[PDB]
Amino acid sequence: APQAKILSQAPTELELQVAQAFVELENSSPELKAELRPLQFKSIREIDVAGGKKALAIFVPVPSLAGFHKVQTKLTRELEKKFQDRHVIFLAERRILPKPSRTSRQVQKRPRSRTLTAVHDKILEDLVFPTEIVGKRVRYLVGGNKIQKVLLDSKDVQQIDYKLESFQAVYNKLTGKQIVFEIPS
RNA sequence: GCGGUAAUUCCAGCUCCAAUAGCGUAUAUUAAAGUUGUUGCAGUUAAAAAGCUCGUAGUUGAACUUUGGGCCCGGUUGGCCG
């Protein structure tokens, strides 16, 4: 049973469909299976897109992100292909530890890898996964609101030019901040 | 500052001003005085930047690390519709 095997937890129908897709990809087999057998995800989050589609957020343990990062292209192509009406993307379950206060207090202090801002920055880096961000800008709007511009490279934006709003909605839903992307020319 | 022959200031007389049963004088002090400066001084030339540099105390010193209630308010994007 490489179905509930490859997550590493029982639920649920979405993740199981995904796992059986993984399995059907593994059955390719040779080059795909070779690096797709160790790569397991943990959970999935299906959420809205401003258009019609939904968006798959595939959560990961983050020692697997390397092999996941080697592929991403073929998993996003095949999963978007099979599970249509969707925008697929993988992400890493990064633990956020709370900020030390006088009430709450923790030994094994709190490295900056585990802080919130870093985790949020990395989430963006994985949403894009390709296309090394050229810049970030943050407008602070007079209505006390905040928006982040993320400046992308023109290379390989064709692969994700149809996912921007989904990424925006995702980051807004998880992190709570508004978002926009941009490519200089 | 007045005053050396016809003194608007001296000495008297007259007239008048202020304060008033209190007034003046002298000294010390106070704000005035941002003329001792934390607020708040100054330093080309008016008094004052060490001949210049290092340097201990001293003074000072880049940026960075997630939030419980509820109500109202209005923005700014998003869709859903145009």
PDB file of C-alpha atoms (C1' of nucleotides) in Angstrom:
ATOM      1  CA  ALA A   1       0.000   0.000   0.000  1.00  0.00           C
ATOM      2  CA  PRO A   2       1.973   3.014  -1.266  1.00  0.00           C
ATOM      3  CA  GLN A   3      -1.165   5.182  -0.820  1.00  0.00           C
ATOM      4  CA  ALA A   4      -1.483   6.148   2.852  1.00  0.00           C
ATOM      5  CA  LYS A   5       2.204   5.262   3.001  1.00  0.00           C
ATOM      6  CA  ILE A   6       3.355   8.249   1.033  1.00  0.00           C
ATOM      7  CA  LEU A   7       1.901  11.118   3.056  1.00  0.00           C
ATOM      8  CA  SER A   8       2.603   9.990   6.353  1.00  0.00           C
ATOM      9  CA  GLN A   9      -0.842  10.168   7.960  1.00  0.00           C
ATOM     10  CA  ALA A  10      -4.289   8.686   7.328  1.00  0.00           C
ATOM     11  CA  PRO A  11      -6.547  11.464   5.969  1.00  0.00           C
ATOM     12  CA  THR A  12      -7.930  12.262   3.492  1.00  0.00           C
ATOM     13  CA  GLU A  13      -9.611  11.792   0.130  1.00  0.00           C
ATOM     14  CA  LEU A  14      -7.698  14.682  -1.409  1.00  0.00           C
ATOM     15  CA  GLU A  15      -4.328  13.539  -0.148  1.00  0.00           C
ATOM     16  CA  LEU A  16      -5.124   9.970  -1.103  1.00  0.00           C
ATOM     17  CA  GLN A  17      -6.056  10.985  -4.637  1.00  0.00           C
ATOM     18  CA  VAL A  18      -2.785  12.908  -4.683  1.00  0.00           C
ATOM     19  CA  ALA A  19      -0.892   9.889  -3.405  1.00  0.00           C
ATOM     20  CA  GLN A  20      -2.425   7.644  -6.032  1.00  0.00           C
ATOM     21  CA  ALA A  21      -1.389  10.244  -8.582  1.00  0.00           C
ATOM     22  CA  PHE A  22       2.103   9.983  -7.083  1.00  0.00           C
ATOM     23  CA  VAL A  23       1.816   6.235  -7.465  1.00  0.00           C
ATOM     24  CA  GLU A  24       0.682   6.473 -11.083  1.00  0.00           C
ATOM     25  CA  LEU A  25       3.669   8.780 -11.638  1.00  0.00           C
ATOM     26  CA  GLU A  26       5.919   6.267  -9.873  1.00  0.00           C
ATOM     27  CA  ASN A  27       4.549   3.618 -12.229  1.00  0.00           C
ATOM     28  CA  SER A  28       6.013   5.687 -15.115  1.00  0.00           C
ATOM     29  CA  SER A  29       8.464   4.419 -13.719  1.00  0.00           C
ATOM     30  CA  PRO A  30      12.115   4.638 -14.163  1.00  0.00           C
ATOM     31  CA  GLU A  31      13.517   8.140 -13.849  1.00  0.00           C
ATOM     32  CA  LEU A  32      10.428   9.513 -12.167  1.00  0.00           C
ATOM     33  CA  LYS A  33       9.947   6.764  -9.572  1.00  0.00           C
ATOM     34  CA  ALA A  34      13.651   6.846  -8.697  1.00  0.00           C
ATOM     35  CA  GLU A  35      13.227  10.252  -7.066  1.00  0.00           C
ATOM     36  CA  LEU A  36       9.486  10.198  -6.401  1.00  0.00           C
ATOM     37  CA  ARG A  37       9.460   7.274  -3.987  1.00  0.00           C
ATOM     38  CA  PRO A  38      11.160   9.198  -1.116  1.00  0.00           C
ATOM     39  CA  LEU A  39       9.237  12.417  -1.690  1.00  0.00           C
ATOM     40  CA  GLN A  40       6.194  12.446   0.552  1.00  0.00           C
ATOM     41  CA  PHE A  41       4.003  15.378   1.531  1.00  0.00           C
ATOM     42  CA  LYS A  42       2.015  15.741   4.727  1.00  0.00           C
ATOM     43  CA  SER A  43      -1.203  17.592   4.166  1.00  0.00           C
ATOM     44  CA  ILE A  44      -3.139  19.461   1.488  1.00  0.00           C
ATOM     45  CA  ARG A  45      -5.186  22.633   1.505  1.00  0.00           C
ATOM     46  CA  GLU A  46      -7.694  23.336  -1.232  1.00  0.00           C
ATOM     47  CA  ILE A  47      -8.705  26.970  -1.424  1.00  0.00           C
ATOM     48  CA  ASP A  48     -10.349  29.459  -3.721  1.00  0.00           C
ATOM     49  CA  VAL A  49      -8.996  31.427  -6.632  1.00  0.00           C
ATOM     50  CA  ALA A  50     -10.404  34.838  -7.499  1.00  0.00           C
ATOM     51  CA  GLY A  51     -11.333  33.431 -10.905  1.00  0.00           C
ATOM     52  CA  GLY A  52     -13.027  30.059 -11.085  1.00  0.00           C
ATOM     53  CA  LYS A  53     -10.326  27.596 -10.041  1.00  0.00           C
ATOM     54  CA  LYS A  54      -9.054  26.311  -6.734  1.00  0.00           C
ATOM     55  CA  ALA A  55      -5.508  26.066  -5.459  1.00  0.00           C
ATOM     56  CA  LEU A  56      -3.736  23.059  -3.959  1.00  0.00           C
ATOM     57  CA  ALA A  57      -1.241  23.743  -1.183  1.00  0.00           C
ATOM     58  CA  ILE A  58       0.867  20.629  -0.681  1.00  0.00           C
ATOM     59  CA  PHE A  59       2.613  20.750   2.687  1.00  0.00           C
ATOM     60  CA  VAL A  60       5.993  19.078   3.134  1.00  0.00           C
ATOM     61  CA  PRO A  61       8.306  18.066   6.049  1.00  0.00           C
ATOM     62  CA  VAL A  62      11.205  20.266   4.724  1.00  0.00           C
ATOM     63  CA  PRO A  63      14.041  17.883   4.553  1.00  0.00           C
ATOM     64  CA  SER A  64      12.431  16.640   1.349  1.00  0.00           C
ATOM     65  CA  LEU A  65      12.204  20.073  -0.242  1.00  0.00           C
ATOM     66  CA  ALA A  66      15.415  19.442  -2.181  1.00  0.00           C
ATOM     67  CA  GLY A  67      14.134  16.521  -4.244  1.00  0.00           C
ATOM     68  CA  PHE A  68      10.760  18.218  -4.383  1.00  0.00           C
ATOM     69  CA  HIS A  69      12.611  21.294  -5.637  1.00  0.00           C
ATOM     70  CA  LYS A  70      14.374  19.185  -8.222  1.00  0.00           C
ATOM     71  CA  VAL A  71      11.063  18.284  -9.789  1.00  0.00           C
ATOM     72  CA  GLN A  72       8.131  20.589  -9.027  1.00  0.00           C
ATOM     73  CA  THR A  73       7.593  21.121 -12.787  1.00  0.00           C
ATOM     74  CA  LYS A  74       6.354  17.671 -13.573  1.00  0.00           C
ATOM     75  CA  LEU A  75       4.343  17.335 -10.414  1.00  0.00           C
ATOM     76  CA  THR A  76       2.669  20.645 -11.025  1.00  0.00           C
ATOM     77  CA  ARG A  77       2.060  19.801 -14.683  1.00  0.00           C
ATOM     78  CA  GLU A  78       0.625  16.341 -14.032  1.00  0.00           C
ATOM     79  CA  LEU A  79      -1.409  17.314 -10.977  1.00  0.00           C
ATOM     80  CA  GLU A  80      -2.808  20.421 -12.670  1.00  0.00           C
ATOM     81  CA  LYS A  81      -3.467  18.134 -15.654  1.00  0.00           C
ATOM     82  CA  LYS A  82      -5.266  15.424 -13.747  1.00  0.00           C
ATOM     83  CA  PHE A  83      -6.981  17.481 -11.053  1.00  0.00           C
ATOM     84  CA  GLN A  84      -8.100  20.232 -13.371  1.00  0.00           C
ATOM     85  CA  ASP A  85      -9.802  23.466 -12.314  1.00  0.00           C
ATOM     86  CA  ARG A  86      -6.822  23.789  -9.946  1.00  0.00           C
ATOM     87  CA  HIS A  87      -3.489  25.516  -9.466  1.00  0.00           C
ATOM     88  CA  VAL A  88      -1.026  23.130  -7.866  1.00  0.00           C
ATOM     89  CA  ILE A  89       1.830  24.202  -5.651  1.00  0.00           C
ATOM     90  CA  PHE A  90       4.037  22.575  -3.061  1.00  0.00           C
ATOM     91  CA  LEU A  91       5.166  24.245   0.135  1.00  0.00           C
ATOM     92  CA  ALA A  92       7.136  23.389   3.219  1.00  0.00           C
ATOM     93  CA  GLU A  93       5.655  23.043   6.681  1.00  0.00           C
ATOM     94  CA  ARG A  94       7.925  25.399   8.574  1.00  0.00           C
ATOM     95  CA  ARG A  95       7.547  25.644  12.296  1.00  0.00           C
ATOM     96  CA  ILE A  96       6.980  29.091  13.740  1.00  0.00           C
ATOM     97  CA  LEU A  97       7.991  29.377  17.355  1.00  0.00           C
ATOM     98  CA  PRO A  98       6.507  32.220  19.371  1.00  0.00           C
ATOM     99  CA  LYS A  99       8.224  35.422  20.329  1.00  0.00           C
ATOM    100  CA  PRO A 100       9.608  35.399  23.878  1.00  0.00           C
ATOM    101  CA  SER A 101       7.717  37.564  26.315  1.00  0.00           C
ATOM    102  CA  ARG A 102       7.803  38.130  30.023  1.00  0.00           C
ATOM    103  CA  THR A 103       4.783  35.836  30.487  1.00  0.00           C
ATOM    104  CA  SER A 104       5.562  33.132  27.925  1.00  0.00           C
ATOM    105  CA  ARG A 105       9.186  32.052  28.158  1.00  0.00           C
ATOM    106  CA  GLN A 106      11.344  29.409  26.502  1.00  0.00           C
ATOM    107  CA  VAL A 107      14.800  27.924  26.813  1.00  0.00           C
ATOM    108  CA  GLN A 108      16.620  26.705  23.695  1.00  0.00           C
ATOM    109  CA  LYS A 109      16.251  30.337  22.865  1.00  0.00           C
ATOM    110  CA  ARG A 110      14.776  31.084  19.388  1.00  0.00           C
ATOM    111  CA  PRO A 111      16.883  31.190  16.202  1.00  0.00           C
ATOM    112  CA  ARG A 112      15.996  33.539  13.408  1.00  0.00           C
ATOM    113  CA  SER A 113      15.379  30.622  11.044  1.00  0.00           C
ATOM    114  CA  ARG A 114      12.387  29.797  13.200  1.00  0.00           C
ATOM    115  CA  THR A 115      11.047  33.363  13.445  1.00  0.00           C
ATOM    116  CA  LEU A 116       7.877  34.461  11.766  1.00  0.00           C
ATOM    117  CA  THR A 117       9.219  36.897   9.221  1.00  0.00           C
ATOM    118  CA  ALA A 118      11.709  34.386   7.900  1.00  0.00           C
ATOM    119  CA  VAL A 119       9.052  31.715   7.620  1.00  0.00           C
ATOM    120  CA  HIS A 120       6.821  34.133   5.746  1.00  0.00           C
ATOM    121  CA  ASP A 121       9.621  35.148   3.410  1.00  0.00           C
ATOM    122  CA  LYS A 122      10.354  31.509   2.660  1.00  0.00           C
ATOM    123  CA  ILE A 123       6.715  30.718   1.960  1.00  0.00           C
ATOM    124  CA  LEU A 124       6.922  33.268  -0.829  1.00  0.00           C
ATOM    125  CA  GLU A 125      10.109  31.721  -2.129  1.00  0.00           C
ATOM    126  CA  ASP A 126       8.320  28.373  -2.361  1.00  0.00           C
ATOM    127  CA  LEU A 127       5.105  29.705  -3.898  1.00  0.00           C
ATOM    128  CA  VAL A 128       7.168  31.119  -6.773  1.00  0.00           C
ATOM    129  CA  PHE A 129       9.354  28.161  -6.359  1.00  0.00           C
ATOM    130  CA  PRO A 130      11.348  28.967  -9.538  1.00  0.00           C
ATOM    131  CA  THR A 131      11.967  32.592 -10.520  1.00  0.00           C
ATOM    132  CA  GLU A 132      14.332  34.022  -7.934  1.00  0.00           C
ATOM    133  CA  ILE A 133      12.638  37.213  -6.751  1.00  0.00           C
ATOM    134  CA  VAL A 134      14.432  40.315  -7.972  1.00  0.00           C
ATOM    135  CA  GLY A 135      12.951  42.569  -5.330  1.00  0.00           C
ATOM    136  CA  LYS A 136      10.396  43.195  -2.676  1.00  0.00           C
ATOM    137  CA  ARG A 137       8.625  46.464  -2.083  1.00  0.00           C
ATOM    138  CA  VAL A 138       6.049  47.294   0.575  1.00  0.00           C
ATOM    139  CA  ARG A 139       3.534  50.055   0.119  1.00  0.00           C
ATOM    140  CA  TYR A 140       1.964  51.360   3.284  1.00  0.00           C
ATOM    141  CA  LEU A 141      -1.349  52.793   2.246  1.00  0.00           C
ATOM    142  CA  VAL A 142      -3.035  55.733   3.941  1.00  0.00           C
ATOM    143  CA  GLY A 143      -5.889  53.496   5.074  1.00  0.00           C
ATOM    144  CA  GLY A 144      -3.451  51.796   7.437  1.00  0.00           C
ATOM    145  CA  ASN A 145      -3.318  48.888   5.024  1.00  0.00           C
ATOM    146  CA  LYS A 146      -0.190  47.147   3.760  1.00  0.00           C
ATOM    147  CA  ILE A 147       0.625  45.558   0.431  1.00  0.00           C
ATOM    148  CA  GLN A 148       3.720  43.719  -0.724  1.00  0.00           C
ATOM    149  CA  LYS A 149       5.012  43.876  -4.264  1.00  0.00           C
ATOM    150  CA  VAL A 150       7.245  40.981  -5.257  1.00  0.00           C
ATOM    151  CA  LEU A 151       9.472  41.580  -8.237  1.00  0.00           C
ATOM    152  CA  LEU A 152      10.085  38.505 -10.337  1.00  0.00           C
ATOM    153  CA  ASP A 153      12.574  37.730 -13.059  1.00  0.00           C
ATOM    154  CA  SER A 154      11.327  37.518 -16.628  1.00  0.00           C
ATOM    155  CA  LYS A 155      12.741  33.980 -16.992  1.00  0.00           C
ATOM    156  CA  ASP A 156      10.285  31.076 -16.745  1.00  0.00           C
ATOM    157  CA  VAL A 157       7.398  33.247 -15.610  1.00  0.00           C
ATOM    158  CA  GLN A 158       5.440  31.549 -18.418  1.00  0.00           C
ATOM    159  CA  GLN A 159       5.014  28.500 -16.210  1.00  0.00           C
ATOM    160  CA  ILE A 160       3.135  30.408 -13.517  1.00  0.00           C
ATOM    161  CA  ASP A 161       1.763  33.490 -15.295  1.00  0.00           C
ATOM    162  CA  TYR A 162      -1.699  32.027 -14.740  1.00  0.00           C
ATOM    163  CA  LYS A 163      -1.267  31.392 -10.992  1.00  0.00           C
ATOM    164  CA  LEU A 164      -0.491  34.850  -9.628  1.00  0.00           C
ATOM    165  CA  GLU A 165      -3.883  35.620  -8.167  1.00  0.00           C
ATOM    166  CA  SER A 166      -4.002  32.164  -6.666  1.00  0.00           C
ATOM    167  CA  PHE A 167      -0.652  32.768  -5.003  1.00  0.00           C
ATOM    168  CA  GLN A 168      -1.929  36.134  -3.841  1.00  0.00           C
ATOM    169  CA  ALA A 169      -5.009  34.572  -2.327  1.00  0.00           C
ATOM    170  CA  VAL A 170      -2.929  31.835  -0.738  1.00  0.00           C
ATOM    171  CA  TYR A 171      -0.513  34.180   0.926  1.00  0.00           C
ATOM    172  CA  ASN A 172      -3.404  36.374   1.969  1.00  0.00           C
ATOM    173  CA  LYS A 173      -5.262  33.407   3.423  1.00  0.00           C
ATOM    174  CA  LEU A 174      -2.309  31.948   5.332  1.00  0.00           C
ATOM    175  CA  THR A 175      -0.241  34.964   6.289  1.00  0.00           C
ATOM    176  CA  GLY A 176      -2.823  37.705   6.223  1.00  0.00           C
ATOM    177  CA  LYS A 177      -1.123  40.220   3.930  1.00  0.00           C
ATOM    178  CA  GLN A 178      -2.042  41.586   0.516  1.00  0.00           C
ATOM    179  CA  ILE A 179       0.231  40.833  -2.396  1.00  0.00           C
ATOM    180  CA  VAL A 180       1.071  41.541  -6.021  1.00  0.00           C
ATOM    181  CA  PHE A 181       3.790  40.346  -8.361  1.00  0.00           C
ATOM    182  CA  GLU A 182       5.642  42.208 -11.079  1.00  0.00           C
ATOM    183  CA  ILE A 183       8.163  41.573 -13.831  1.00  0.00           C
ATOM    184  CA  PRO A 184      10.456  44.353 -14.990  1.00  0.00           C
ATOM    185  CA  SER A 185      11.144  44.436 -18.700  1.00  0.00           C
TER     186      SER A 185
ATOM    187  C1'   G B   1      26.268 114.039  31.973  1.00  0.00           C
ATOM    188  C1'   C B   2      25.468 119.679  34.228  1.00  0.00           C
ATOM    189  C1'   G B   3      28.614 123.903  35.738  1.00  0.00           C
ATOM    190  C1'   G B   4      34.027 128.724  32.933  1.00  0.00           C
ATOM    191  C1'   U B   5      28.453 135.044  33.329  1.00  0.00           C
ATOM    192  C1'   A B   6      22.479 135.960  31.258  1.00  0.00           C
ATOM    193  C1'   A B   7      23.100 127.281  34.197  1.00  0.00           C
ATOM    194  C1'   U B   8      15.644 123.860  31.451  1.00  0.00           C
ATOM    195  C1'   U B   9      20.396 119.707  36.512  1.00  0.00           C
ATOM    196  C1'   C B  10      24.428 123.595  41.714  1.00  0.00           C
ATOM    197  C1'   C B  11      22.351 127.176  46.140  1.00  0.00           C
ATOM    198  C1'   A B  12      17.744 129.512  47.723  1.00  0.00           C
ATOM    199  C1'   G B  13      12.302 131.412  46.290  1.00  0.00           C
ATOM    200  C1'   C B  14       8.050 130.180  43.235  1.00  0.00           C
ATOM    201  C1'   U B  15       5.544 126.397  40.431  1.00  0.00           C
ATOM    202  C1'   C B  16       4.851 121.346  39.484  1.00  0.00           C
ATOM    203  C1'   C B  17       5.601 115.387  39.429  1.00  0.00           C
ATOM    204  C1'   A B  18       5.606 110.614  42.132  1.00  0.00           C
ATOM    205  C1'   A B  19       4.551 107.851  46.594  1.00  0.00           C
ATOM    206  C1'   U B  20       2.090 108.737  50.948  1.00  0.00           C
ATOM    207  C1'   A B  21       2.240 107.802  57.192  1.00  0.00           C
ATOM    208  C1'   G B  22       5.265 106.322  54.913  1.00  0.00           C
ATOM    209  C1'   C B  23       9.536 107.905  51.824  1.00  0.00           C
ATOM    210  C1'   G B  24      14.767 107.636  50.812  1.00  0.00           C
ATOM    211  C1'   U B  25      19.745 106.027  51.410  1.00  0.00           C
ATOM    212  C1'   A B  26      23.557 101.900  51.718  1.00  0.00           C
ATOM    213  C1'   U B  27      24.789  96.869  51.307  1.00  0.00           C
ATOM    214  C1'   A B  28      23.563  91.448  49.948  1.00  0.00           C
ATOM    215  C1'   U B  29      20.148  89.053  46.890  1.00  0.00           C
ATOM    216  C1'   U B  30      16.338  88.003  43.365  1.00  0.00           C
ATOM    217  C1'   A B  31      13.720  88.233  37.972  1.00  0.00           C
ATOM    218  C1'   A B  32      15.502  91.587  34.496  1.00  0.00           C
ATOM    219  C1'   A B  33      20.039  87.932  32.508  1.00  0.00           C
ATOM    220  C1'   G B  34      18.781  83.603  26.560  1.00  0.00           C
ATOM    221  C1'   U B  35      25.034  88.441  30.557  1.00  0.00           C
ATOM    222  C1'   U B  36      26.167  81.141  32.846  1.00  0.00           C
ATOM    223  C1'   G B  37      22.516  79.004  28.684  1.00  0.00           C
ATOM    224  C1'   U B  38      19.003  71.195  30.550  1.00  0.00           C
ATOM    225  C1'   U B  39      14.969  74.036  28.479  1.00  0.00           C
ATOM    226  C1'   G B  40      18.541  78.100  26.146  1.00  0.00           C
ATOM    227  C1'   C B  41      24.275  81.298  24.919  1.00  0.00           C
ATOM    228  C1'   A B  42      28.783  82.016  21.983  1.00  0.00           C
ATOM    229  C1'   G B  43      33.691  80.528  19.368  1.00  0.00           C
ATOM    230  C1'   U B  44      36.295  83.256  10.859  1.00  0.00           C
ATOM    231  C1'   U B  45      36.633  88.664  12.237  1.00  0.00           C
ATOM    232  C1'   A B  46      33.627  91.245  18.251  1.00  0.00           C
ATOM    233  C1'   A B  47      36.592  87.077  24.306  1.00  0.00           C
ATOM    234  C1'   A B  48      37.374  82.347  23.167  1.00  0.00           C
ATOM    235  C1'   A B  49      38.901  75.628  18.259  1.00  0.00           C
ATOM    236  C1'   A B  50      44.199  72.694  21.923  1.00  0.00           C
ATOM    237  C1'   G B  51      49.892  73.195  16.472  1.00  0.00           C
ATOM    238  C1'   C B  52      48.425  68.258  14.957  1.00  0.00           C
ATOM    239  C1'   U B  53      47.648  63.068  15.936  1.00  0.00           C
ATOM    240  C1'   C B  54      47.042  58.413  18.978  1.00  0.00           C
ATOM    241  C1'   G B  55      44.616  57.055  23.455  1.00  0.00           C
ATOM    242  C1'   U B  56      42.394  54.915  28.838  1.00  0.00           C
ATOM    243  C1'   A B  57      38.336  56.291  31.749  1.00  0.00           C
ATOM    244  C1'   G B  58      33.834  58.937  30.378  1.00  0.00           C
ATOM    245  C1'   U B  59      29.918  60.067  26.875  1.00  0.00           C
ATOM    246  C1'   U B  60      27.733  57.662  22.701  1.00  0.00           C
ATOM    247  C1'   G B  61      26.844  54.008  19.394  1.00  0.00           C
ATOM    248  C1'   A B  62      23.640  50.711  12.551  1.00  0.00           C
ATOM    249  C1'   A B  63      19.396  47.487  11.205  1.00  0.00           C
ATOM    250  C1'   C B  64      16.839  42.898  12.492  1.00  0.00           C
ATOM    251  C1'   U B  65      13.144  38.393  15.918  1.00  0.00           C
ATOM    252  C1'   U B  66       3.852  37.565  15.995  1.00  0.00           C
ATOM    253  C1'   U B  67      -1.022  39.731  18.079  1.00  0.00           C
ATOM    254  C1'   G B  68      -6.744  37.443  22.120  1.00  0.00           C
ATOM    255  C1'   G B  69     -12.823  39.451  23.868  1.00  0.00           C
ATOM    256  C1'   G B  70     -16.887  41.998  21.443  1.00  0.00           C
ATOM    257  C1'   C B  71     -19.006  46.620  18.887  1.00  0.00           C
ATOM    258  C1'   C B  72     -18.734  50.607  15.348  1.00  0.00           C
ATOM    259  C1'   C B  73     -16.096  53.258  11.585  1.00  0.00           C
ATOM    260  C1'   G B  74     -14.187  53.912   7.205  1.00  0.00           C
ATOM    261  C1'   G B  75     -10.443  52.500   3.236  1.00  0.00           C
ATOM    262  C1'   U B  76      -8.269  48.326  -0.648  1.00  0.00           C
ATOM    263  C1'   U B  77      -7.915  45.091  -3.150  1.00  0.00           C
ATOM    264  C1'   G B  78     -10.557  40.664  -4.371  1.00  0.00           C
ATOM    265  C1'   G B  79     -14.113  38.348  -6.457  1.00  0.00           C
ATOM    266  C1'   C B  80     -19.924  37.833  -7.451  1.00  0.00           C
ATOM    267  C1'   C B  81     -22.285  40.232 -10.647  1.00  0.00           C
ATOM    268  C1'   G B  82     -21.307  45.586 -15.651  1.00  0.00           C
TER     269        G B  82
END
